Amino acid sequence: HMSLENVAFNVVNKGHFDGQQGEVPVSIINNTVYTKVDGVDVELFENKTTLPVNVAFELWAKRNIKPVPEVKILNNLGVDIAANTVIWDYKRDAPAHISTIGVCSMTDIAKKPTETICAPLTVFFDGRVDGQVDLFRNARNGVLITEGSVKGLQPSVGPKQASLNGVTLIGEAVKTQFNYYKKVDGVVQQLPETYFTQSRNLQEFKPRSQMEIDFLELAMDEFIERYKLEGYAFEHIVYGDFSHSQLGGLHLLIGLAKRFKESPFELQDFIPMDSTVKNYFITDAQTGSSKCVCSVIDLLLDDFVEIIKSQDLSVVSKVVKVTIDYTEISFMLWCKDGHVETFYPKL
Amino acid sequence: HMSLENVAFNVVNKGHFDGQQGEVPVSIINNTVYTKVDGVDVELFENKTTLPVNVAFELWAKRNIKPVPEVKILNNLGVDIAANTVIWDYKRDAPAHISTIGVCSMTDIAKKPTETICAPLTVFFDGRVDGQVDLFRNARNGVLITEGSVKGLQPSVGPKQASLNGVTLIGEAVKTQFNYYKKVDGVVQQLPETYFTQSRNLQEFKPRSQMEIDFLELAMDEFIERYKLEGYAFEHIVYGDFSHSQLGGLHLLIGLAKRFKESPFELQDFIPMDSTVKNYFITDAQTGSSKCVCSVIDLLLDDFVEIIKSQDLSVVSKVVKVTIDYTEISFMLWCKDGHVETFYPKL
Amino acid sequence: HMSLENVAFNVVNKGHFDGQQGEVPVSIINNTVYTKVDGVDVELFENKTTLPVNVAFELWAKRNIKPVPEVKILNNLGVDIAANTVIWDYKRDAPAHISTIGVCSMTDIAKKPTETICAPLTVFFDGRVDGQVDLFRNARNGVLITEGSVKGLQPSVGPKQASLNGVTLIGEAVKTQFNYYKKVDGVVQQLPETYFTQSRNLQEFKPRSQMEIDFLELAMDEFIERYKLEGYAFEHIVYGDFSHSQLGGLHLLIGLAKRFKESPFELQDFIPMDSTVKNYFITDAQTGSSKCVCSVIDLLLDDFVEIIKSQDLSVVSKVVKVTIDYTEISFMLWCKDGHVETFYPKL
Amino acid sequence: HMSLENVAFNVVNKGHFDGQQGEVPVSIINNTVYTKVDGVDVELFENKTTLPVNVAFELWAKRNIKPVPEVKILNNLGVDIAANTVIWDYKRDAPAHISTIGVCSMTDIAKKPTETICAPLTVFFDGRVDGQVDLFRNARNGVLITEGSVKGLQPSVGPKQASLNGVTLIGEAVKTQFNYYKKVDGVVQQLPETYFTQSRNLQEFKPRSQMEIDFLELAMDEFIERYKLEGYAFEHIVYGDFSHSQLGGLHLLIGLAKRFKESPFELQDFIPMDSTVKNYFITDAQTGSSKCVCSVIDLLLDDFVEIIKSQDLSVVSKVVKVTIDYTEISFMLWCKDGHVETFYPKL
Amino acid sequence: HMSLENVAFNVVNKGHFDGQQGEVPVSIINNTVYTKVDGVDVELFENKTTLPVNVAFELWAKRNIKPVPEVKILNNLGVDIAANTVIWDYKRDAPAHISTIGVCSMTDIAKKPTETICAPLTVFFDGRVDGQVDLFRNARNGVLITEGSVKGLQPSVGPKQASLNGVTLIGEAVKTQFNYYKKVDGVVQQLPETYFTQSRNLQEFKPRSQMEIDFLELAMDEFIERYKLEGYAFEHIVYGDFSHSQLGGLHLLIGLAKRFKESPFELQDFIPMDSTVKNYFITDAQTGSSKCVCSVIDLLLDDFVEIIKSQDLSVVSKVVKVTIDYTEISFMLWCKDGHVETFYPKL
Secondary structure, three states: OOOHHHHHHHHHHOOOOOOOOOOOOEEEOOOEEEEEEOOEEEEEEEOOOOOOHHHHHHHHHOOOOOOEOOHHHHHHOOOOEEOOOOOEEOOOOEEOOOOEEOOOOOOEEEOOOOOHHHOOOOEEEEOOOOOHHHHHHOOOOEEEEEOOOOOOOOOEEOOOOEEEOOEEEOOOOOOOOOEEEEEEOOEEOOOOOOEOOOOOOOOOOOOOOHHHHHHHHOOHHHHHHHOOOOOOOHHHHHHOOOOOOEOOOOOEHHHHHHHHHHOOEEEEOOOOOOOOOEEEEEEEOOOOOEEEEEEEEOOOHHHHHHHHHOOOOOOOEEEEEEEEOOEEEEEEEEEEOOEEEEEEEOO | OOOHHHHHHHHHOOOOOOOOOOOOOEEEOOOEEEEEEOOEEEEEEEOOOOOOHHHHHHHHHOOOOOOEOOHHHHHHOOOOEEOOOOOEEOOOOEEOOOOEEOOOOOOEEEOOOOOHHHOOOOEEEEOOOOOHHHHHHOOOOEEEEEOOOOOOOOOEEOOOOEEEOOEEEOOOOOOOOOEEEEEEOOEEOOOOOOEOOOOOOOOOOOOOOHHHHHHHHOOHHHHHHOOOOOOOOHHHHHHOEOOOOEOEOOOOOHHHHHHHHHOOOEEEOOOOOOOOOEEEEEEOOOOOOEEEEEEEOOOOHHHHHHHHOOOOOOOOEEEEEEEEOOEEEEEEEEEEOOEEEEEEEOO | OOOHHHHHHHHHHOOOOOOOOOOOOEEEOOOEEEEEEOOEEEEEEEOOOOOOHHHHHHHHHOOOOOOEOOHHHHHHOOOOEEOOOOOEEOOOOEEOOOOEEOOOOOOEEEOOOOOHHHOOOOEEEEOOOOOHHHHHHOOOOEEEEEOOOOOOOOOEEOOOOEEEOOEEEOOOOOOOOOEEEEEEOOEEOOOOOOEOOOOOOOOOOOOOOHHHHHHHHOOHHHHHHOOOOOOOOHHHHHHOOOOEOEOOOOOEHHHHHHHHOOOOEEEEOOOOOOOOOEEEEEEEOOOOOEEEEEEEEOOOHHHHHHHHOOOOOOOOOOEEEEEEOOEEEEEEEEEEOOEEEEEEEOO | OOOHHHHHHHHHHOOOOOOOOOOOOEEEOOOEEEEEEOOEEEEEEEOOOOOOHHHHHHHHHOOOOOOEOOHHHHHHOOOOEEOOOOOEEOOOOEEOOOOEOOOOOOOEOOOOOOOHHHOOOOEEEEOOOOOHHHHHHOOOOEEEEEOOOOOOOOOEEOOOOEEEOOEEEOOOOOOOOOEEEEEEOOEEOOOOOOEOOOOOOOOOOOOOOHHHHHHHHOOHHHHHHOOOOOOOOOOOOOOOOOOOOEOOOOOOOHHHHHHHHHOOEEEEOOOOOOOOOEEEEEEEOOOOOEEEEEEEOOOOHHHHHHHHOOOOOOOOEEEEEEEEOOEEEEEEEEEEOOEEEEEEEOO | OOOHHHHHHHHHHOOOOOOOOOOOOEEEOOOEEEEEEOOEEEEEEEOOOOOOHHHHHHHHHOOOOOOEOOHHHHHHOOOOEEOOOOOEEOOOOEEOOOOEEOOOOOOEEEOOOOOHHHOOOOEEEEOOOOOOHHHHHOOOOEEEEEOOOOOOOOOEEOOOOEEEOOEEEOOOOOOOOOEEEEEEOOEEOOOOOOEOOOOOOOOOOOOOOHHHHHHHHOOHHHHHHOOOOOOOOHHHHHHOOOOEOEOOOOOEHHHHHHHHHHOOEEEEOOOOOOOOOEEEEEEEOOOOOEEEEEEEEOOOHHHHHHHHHOOOOOOOOOOEEEEEOOEEEEEEEEEEOOEEEEEEEOO
């Protein structure tokens, strides 16, 4: 009993697809799903995806309503498809993966992940569901997450935050902390040591360390002198330069939150997706300084201090590679006469 | 168990909605219903109505597949809604009635015709299905059709033709003649004597009397001397005039079939509906004569002769009323010095 | 003189349809109405309804611009259609009624309300317009509102608030208090005693009594000792749990406005319509507690105290029926020993 | 240099994509591709597929313009994808396969068929292109066609007809006979003996044997006594019944061509796809007989004689399986007292 | 090398069209441009204009990213078209001019502005670009801006603000101040002395003079006794009435900012375009007072004092004409005895 009228029945009552039988009338007109309640037409879902309106409406109702990792983590890892679930990308208002495994007949490429066609793809397994760990041991390419320890496998601790119904949080009523495992062509691989982005928003910005709390409250000269950050060009990289028509650096999200309270500005996210590094079109409303492409990243200020602390100051320029979110990020370093000029993520 | 996937299942197998259980996948995209046979998408229904695509697709599958009266007949009687069926207008690619009675929940204004809301509306009953003759006796306003006799009621013989799956024919494997009955505000009415339009096409024209067979084969002069049709202006009304820029006459359809096979021409309907009187935009192509609005009717040539040979030729102008297809049609008659100039349907 | 160019002329000049003669050019393209001002195209209306773009544009221009009752009041009463006006539901962005009476030819089912087809429907009359009271006395089925007294009829005091151009307010420059009358099948009926929802928003929440002002400011323990609310489970019903992954109660809007400046959260109004009881998908940040369906209501805290302090605490649990907004709402109490456990609106 | 303006340039000049380099302006508006020639807008492509309008326009321009096998042949063999070409389905106005191999970046799943992802899929290879035969030897699952002999493999002769630009013909300026080869999981298979459907239209029917020519010219009784078909029920199954409301047989298409020229009728082709067996909704316009689902097949009359003259007439009911177009078709046989009643394709 | 794939490549990399070679795949579906990044579809542009989706996407990518005058300034002047650039109207989400000169082949009416067809139109020239100035000396109708002095021409100082990427600002990193010139049929014309609209928003309002700062902070009686504003009706024109169901005056944007802080209200911009005078549908909360059309303007409070102080208060009915933003605005002044009643911009 998989029908459009039954899916809309679960949306009306339970809020999501709960497997409850029952039917309600439905009207389809221009990427919008309507229903009739007490004689009036009520909107239920507006298709913003590249799929038909009835297919996307069914995938949205069968979304995962539990804490799941963020899309950028699943994309930095070679994940291609999900197993017996739907991971909804709330930033794109669309699914994160276009094919399914035993969820929607229109998008199903297979009923079970062990089928022959699922071999070259990297399947995502959720250890919190029964029998998923056994299938991961029998899969060729895959990624597994668990809340605890799995016997015989070396775990890699994940980030402290996770997405719940589109809300990134560090849960205390739930876990949001996962152990990560990965197999490639049957061989379990060692995930390297890495940093993690904090995934914070400009508005409702909150510090997470004593060094951060000092950065928001203290002045520019006061913060540099106390934390011995001289000759490291924190004025240009973090604070940013608004003196000329072109904006200088300003490549830390912590540098945006401090400027936002004292002087608002305009951001253009011309590539609206979830990535470790983001590029924005910035135009300072107070001075007039601007820059077409501005690569910004959200690292903990302590971690950025630790990274810049361990680099050579002799060479004029050199490529620096740092593993963040299970992937290598390339930085460009400029040095002149014992001090660094700029240090930004490479384009 | 009403659902979109179940309706498409009956369309794939039985061709129409037969009440068989089973589901098949469906894709909705831009007023078009698709299904997945094997592994390819197949078109099934193209919405050309003013209704949502999923609603019109269900009404089309639940159409009546038995000989039913034509739309122009039901419109002339003032029928407002059908009872427990759907009469599909094949000329408009849309239903003939928008509201339903116990057919589709989205369009159902009632579940039984005896409910209070259906009192002022003219309900159409089909006596060929059980129990309809009792509801007609208990209905305030309704129309009844049968194949035989009904006790205690005076019948009125209908036309010899009917529409079966969009094809108008005079059936011999089935019966297409119906006895008509009508009630208004509780009172049974006496239906008057009337003429019937033959409802024939242009390219596939067929005569239905010896006078018609003689009209097609014989020339203009020899058909007027025989049958004695002088002074009634059959050269203008039926044959038509192509000498000047404006076309003259041509109002009997049988004059179109004769001219069509000897020299084609163009026709624009610009009002595509089923009416007793049709207006066309005609261009002669051969000579260049044309007319914006040309009122055309399809009567048996014997009946048109009987109508014209029953008027007073003394007056100069007079409005004439004729009952055709259970409705009064108005004609304009011009007479000069004891003979007729023109005699066309009023606009 | 009803036309599209004329209606757009009134929209450009007067703002709404004022009946002023004049025309302006119009361009229609994908549910959007454009006009040319100084040589550039300007958007005027975006069709969000299930109606054609030109029909919905005319109904929106002819909307009622005076204080009118809220849609939930008109729906709790058996109101079906409006008489010589258009009540615009500012939620859903669509009219509240789909048929009209002498307003728009496309939607008009009649010109005057006393026509035969309007008898079984419950018509809404506005006593502030001339002659409406007389029609209500001859309406058989209808609902009437007045600012003063009608001789020979027993009035029922309505709520203090009303909607003006979509804004719910308690007007002092105008009068938003109305006397309510209702007739069924010719018989005037007695409207029962009822409570009224306050119709407030989360943001810009404002108390309306001393007990409410004490709720926002005082702590949880101090507000229960005072006002004497022990054993009545205001901790679970109003305050909320937030401790065990699934949210406890939180069934009062006053309970959501306190959680505001303390811990923001997310709300999903998966059925966007105006109802006396609303169901939200809540997911609280910071902790991670959530719940699929949460029935919330916005009563005055004094009224909820008056309701809960008049029940029997002996039974294990029964069903309680209370009248709010001229309709009965079912509550699900729960008791154990000499105290109550939960008391929530029934699904 | 792949671009929309370059593709449209080849469509304007060469007719199809020839890779000639050059650009012309293009306009996209509602599933239609326009171009500007001398200042006026000209339509070039109307999207009727389930793909974006710009993607389908590129696949249509890169279609194969050489004699290729029909889609029903490729479907019966289970072909899943084509190699370095695009097979256009002219009946569906859409490609026969959705994914591509080194043709269009939006649809390309691989650059060469030898990649790992293409292993489980049945790839189609055209031996008329250079290095395609070598890839078929190294392919796990594939289908090979050629005009001559390949050494080391046993060939299977195909049908005499093929599709050229949507026209099915038996060419003499080109060769439409192909040798068929197939591999599954590495092992080459032996294709069984089979019959072939002639793929003929109704309005342009042409006989292909002396028995067919005698069938069209001679009468019913005269064609039965000669060739001797006394108790095999060719007086229906091929001719048809037409006596009652339900139609008898008509299952040979050649029986439709004989009836069509003597009396037209209506045919509804729901599920419009290219299949070995087609189901039509037929309504005889002369008598009124009809049938919802009528299974029709197009075999040479000699072949159908060879099949029916090779069964056991003793049993009452028996399921018969015949290999036609490289697939097994099921038939229902009814016999009574030494003769055959009906013999139709199983639904 | 003009192509859709190359334009999208510059948008992904540089943010705007920079003339960089390279292509990326693109999908078009329902007024939205998509691209494939790491295997997922990402939205890049949503067509809100009256142009095809592919043409508007190219015009938006080629917009001017430098400080340019506002739309109302160019519209108050006779500007019809721009030369070798695209001025994007951010309030309408559409270009300010619909034809181009050497920018987009679909919209190019000419390559260079000196062509014959560009003579009767008023072309916009940017003196900051090489050339341009010399073309203005050889143009028949045009408008020229510059940062410095042009020898032999009398300049006119423009406003102190301009738009940069849709942000109106008084730049100190950039100049944002321009000299204005204009020619009509070959004759240079003298621009009159004018006032300038401040172009400020409501929610983030900021004073710009000592008199304004005193207006926000001080009370109504305190601000009128000082600055001698008795008998000039500043209580009705600027402050507002809010007493009698219909709002009185309130025609200064400075009057809205004061009321918005102390009591929010609703505004309908039923004509969303950039004009010197705006008309809003205002409904004040808490009171219920409203007005269909309320003409508002944003002048410096010192300026409005300077205008009202230099008028004759003895007469009624006269019509006052003031030059603001290079165009004359008509005011209606009402007087009674030795004081003025109202003074608003005329409808």
